[PDB]
Design a protein around this ligand. Structure first.
Ligand SMILES: O=P(O)(O)OP(=O)(O)OP(=O)(O)OC[C@H]1O[C@@H](n2cnc3c(O)ncnc32)[C@H](O)[C@@H]1O
Ligand SMILES: O=P(O)(O)OP(=O)(O)OP(=O)(O)OC[C@H]1O[C@@H](n2cnc3c(O)ncnc32)[C@H](O)[C@@H]1O
Ligand code: NA
Ligand code: NA
Lengths: 185, 185
């Protein structure tokens, strides 16, 4: 089965394609910019995005919104993880966390899926902590400073398969796939 | 003349009302939430906002998008000044600026105006620097840590009239008013 993935993030595509491909699902990236509203919830961005995209792209399609939420920073950078990464970057996050007792944080991914006039959402969350040093060359974004719960390595020190087995995106993808098997034989 | 101001920020209303009121223009706040897209330019948020709002609110109306752009932080928090204020707050900005040589930054305001099926934009910019200490009880948001070029006081240490005479919003309002006098006798 083929599914179009509207996104400008090649990192997400690789991870999504590598996971669903093992089950016979082909992911095709579609660089179709769509309005990503400011909001407090990733879910809200996904809802508006799908409503705007329907009728403008091949079906069935999917989009994804995700972010890093840091407890000591009240959830920041969250929904605006991309902008924050491009401006203050990883060094800016480390700077903000200097002297922070609680370095806990979580990555969350919300996948939006549209087919036959209906939208579906699948989410995944992975808790962890912000490292004091960035390590790793894999992945993208905040991977160099995020170590998932129960691991010694940051996401950047893992391969796609390894990250997918632990990440927020992997969890959302698993829920998504399961839904596909049952609804979409 | 009456103009509806779609905004949820009472601080903006006070400043806008106090400035235009002196010229016989009555500002009425309208709490009508509208999609404020993520974007790199304040202008883009305003353009999309007006397109979404037309036909849903009384006319003529206006909206405004603004932010604080810090040079050493590559423009951050910019368009997402509101979210950043509510999360890391003023302390988060000061933390990020610790040891910063260049504390330069500017506030920018973009006013969007709609009348008779046409949208108009007016902008204003005020340069200054981020203080090391927050001072003042006036204004709102980042006012306690922003001192405009040519002044010793932060925005929070000024009155509405004083701030308006120097701020980004005051400059956008002046351009807006001038346009009103000529086009909208
Ligand atoms: O909107 P699309 O086109 O899908 O691309 P995007 O990546 O710019 O938009 P996102 O709004 O979903 O960006 C959230 C940010 O969250 C970050 N992020 C998400 N998943 C991540 C992961 O597994 N590792 C590191 N950073 C991640 C990353 O910096 C992103 O740019
Ligand atoms: O969208 P509306 O409903 O108009 O309300 P808002 O204030 O939440 O939305 P803005 O997107 O325009 O917010 C930008 C932020 O820029 C900040 N800001 C703008 N003008 C300012 C000023 O004169 N002094 C201090 N902070 C200011 C302030 O923190 C705002 O919340
Ligand atoms: Na997204
Ligand atoms: Na606004």
């Amino acid at each position: 089965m083929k599914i179009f993935f509207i996104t400008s993030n090649p990192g997400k595509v690789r991870e999504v394609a590598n996971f669903l491909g093992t089950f016979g699902i082909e992911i095709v990236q579609l660089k179709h910019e769509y309005p990503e509203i400011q909001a407090e919830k990733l879910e809200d961005v996904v809802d508006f995005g799908i409503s705007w995209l329907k009728g403008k792209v091949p079906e069935p399609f999917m989009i994804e919104d995700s972010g890093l939420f840091i407890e000591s920073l009240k959830g920041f950078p969250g929904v605006y993880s991309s902008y924050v990464y491009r401006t203050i970057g990883l060094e800016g996050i480390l700077k903000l966390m200097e002297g922070a007792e609680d370095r806990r944080a979580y990555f969350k991914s919300v996948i939006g899926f549209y087919i036959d006039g209906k939208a579906y959402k699948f989410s995944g969350v992975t808790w962890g902590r912000i490292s004091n040093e960035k390590r790793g060359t894999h992945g993208f974004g905040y991977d160099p400073i995020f170590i998932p719960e129960g691991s010694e390595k940051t996401f950047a020190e893992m391969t796609i398969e390894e990250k997918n087995a632990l990440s927020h995106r992997g969890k959302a993808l698993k829920a998504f796939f399961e839904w596909l098997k049952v609804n979409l034989k």
